Amino acid sequence: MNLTELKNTPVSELITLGENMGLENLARMRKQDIIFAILKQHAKSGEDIFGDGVLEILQDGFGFLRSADSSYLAGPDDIYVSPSQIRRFNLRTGDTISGKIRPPKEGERYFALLKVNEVNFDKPENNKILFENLTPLHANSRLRMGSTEDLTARVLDLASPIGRGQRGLIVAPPKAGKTMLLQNIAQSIAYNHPDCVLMVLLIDERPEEVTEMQRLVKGEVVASTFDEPASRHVQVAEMVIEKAKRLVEHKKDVIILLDSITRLARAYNTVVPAVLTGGVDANALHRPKRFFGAARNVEEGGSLTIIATALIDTGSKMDEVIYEEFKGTGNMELHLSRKIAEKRVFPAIDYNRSGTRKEELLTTQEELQKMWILRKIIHPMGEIDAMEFLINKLAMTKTNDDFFEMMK
Numbered sequence: 001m002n003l004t005e006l007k008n009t010p011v012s013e014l015i016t017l018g019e020n021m022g023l024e025n026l027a028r029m030r031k032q033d034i035i036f037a038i039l040k041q042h043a044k045s046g047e048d049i050f051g052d053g054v055l056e057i058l059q060d061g062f063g064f065l066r067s068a069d070s071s072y073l074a075g076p077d078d079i080y081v082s083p084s085q086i087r088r089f090n091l092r093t094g095d096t097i098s099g100k101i102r103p104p105k106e107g108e109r110y111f112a113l114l115k116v117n118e119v120n121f122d123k124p125e126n127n128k129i130l131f132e133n134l135t136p137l138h139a140n141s142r143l144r145m146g147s148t149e150d151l152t153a154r155v156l157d158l159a160s161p162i163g164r165g166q167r168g169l170i171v172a173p174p175k176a177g178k179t180m181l182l183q184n185i186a187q188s189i190a191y192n193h194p195d196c197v198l199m200v201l202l203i204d205e206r207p208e209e210v211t212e213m214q215r216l217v218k219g220e221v222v223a224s225t226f227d228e229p230a231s232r233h234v235q236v237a238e239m240v241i242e243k244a245k246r247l248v249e250h251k252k253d254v255i256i257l258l259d260s261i262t263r264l265a266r267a268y269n270t271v272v273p274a275v276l277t278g279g280v281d282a283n284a285l286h287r288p289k290r291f292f293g294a295a296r297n298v299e300e301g302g303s304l305t306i307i308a309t310a311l312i313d314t315g316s317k318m319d320e321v322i323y324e325e326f327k328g329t330g331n332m333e334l335h336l337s338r339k340i341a342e343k344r345v346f347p348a349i350d351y352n353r354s355g356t357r358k359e360e361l362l363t364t365q366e367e368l369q370k371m372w373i374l375r376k377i378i379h380p381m382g383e384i385d386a387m388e389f390l391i392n393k394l395a396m397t398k399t400n401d402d403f404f405e406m407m408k
């Protein structure tokens, strides 16, 4: 007597019951559409129907349990929540409600929630929200990150360390090795810290890039495709960040690997304007600045760390304005050099103009002391002839032995 055995299933596989049930024809029905016909059939013979989703309260006071699998897309398989059920348990957008659901009545489109079991993976008896969580520093906890796959991660913990609940900005021009850098972060965080909920968000991304990201990354991978309207690029980011805070409310750590603040801001721009400077509404930047600005280490407990990408040298006059607005709004900067990518040289990062401010407190009292040694002999070093020196003086060693036996 259940139907939550597996909801997150592939399309061709989901037709398991489509080859077992007494269904007429299922030729032109979507994946989210076919679950609706199956759920109603398991309702025809009484039974109990369990279910879960992510809360999104609409303009009219009611909400729906949006499927995290479908990147919070609106579908028929969504579970409805009444305004009465919102007041009953103090529910806000971003909540992960789970429990028994009910079949629709006559004149009802959606399936509705019946019983509430877990809110935010916890009993309905819980407190303080992210908006009033005291935010002192990013340095009390650290996300430390001999294969060549650990070469696009080794430089990071020397060039620009990643703090727990830290605002990070990756700056990259087209074709600089940006997409796989995020895939290298995702590895050096899952294969190192499998406790903090990892969310990988991609705005206005290609269909082949999202599926590859969905494959290689362990965790929540929410993304919007290029064919989708400008409004949907917002909805996903609006839903990912609203769930993230809700988890930080439970003293839990959350890391968001957002792709392109620009591509997110370009969406936030085409969805409400008024007076322009170079094709960008100056008022529109307020909404995406709230997204990136939420990244913090909470004093009471938990963290929210957003390591997002900024696009420079796109060619567009709009994209040049966006990065300028975000220059130093974060406290962690990782530049990606154009010239190092032009001559096939990877872990391509501008070590020189890529620091990670407020460092002192993120490392031990002398963990930084042997890091400023190389940092003092980079000024006379070139650009493309600076990264080759960072491989040979690293490959023959490990992490802490990088200078103890490498000082002549």
Ligand SMILES: Nc1ncnc2c1ncn2[C@@H]1O[C@H](COP(=O)(O)OP(=O)(O)OP(O)(O)=S)[C@@H](O)[C@H]1O
Residues within 6 Å of the ligand: 152, 173, 174, 175, 176, 177, 178, 179, 180, 181, 184, 346, 347
């Ligand atoms: N860590 C890495 N190790 C080895 N090769 C890399 C690494 N990062 C990037 N590359 C190479 O650099 C190229 C960059 O392609 P992507 O991984 O898609 O990065 P990208 O700069 O985001 O590409 P665009 O601009 O979105 S088409 C690839 O062809 C890879 O071969």
Ligand SMILES: [Mg+2]
Residues within 6 Å of the ligand: 178, 179, 209
């Ligand atoms: Mg890419």
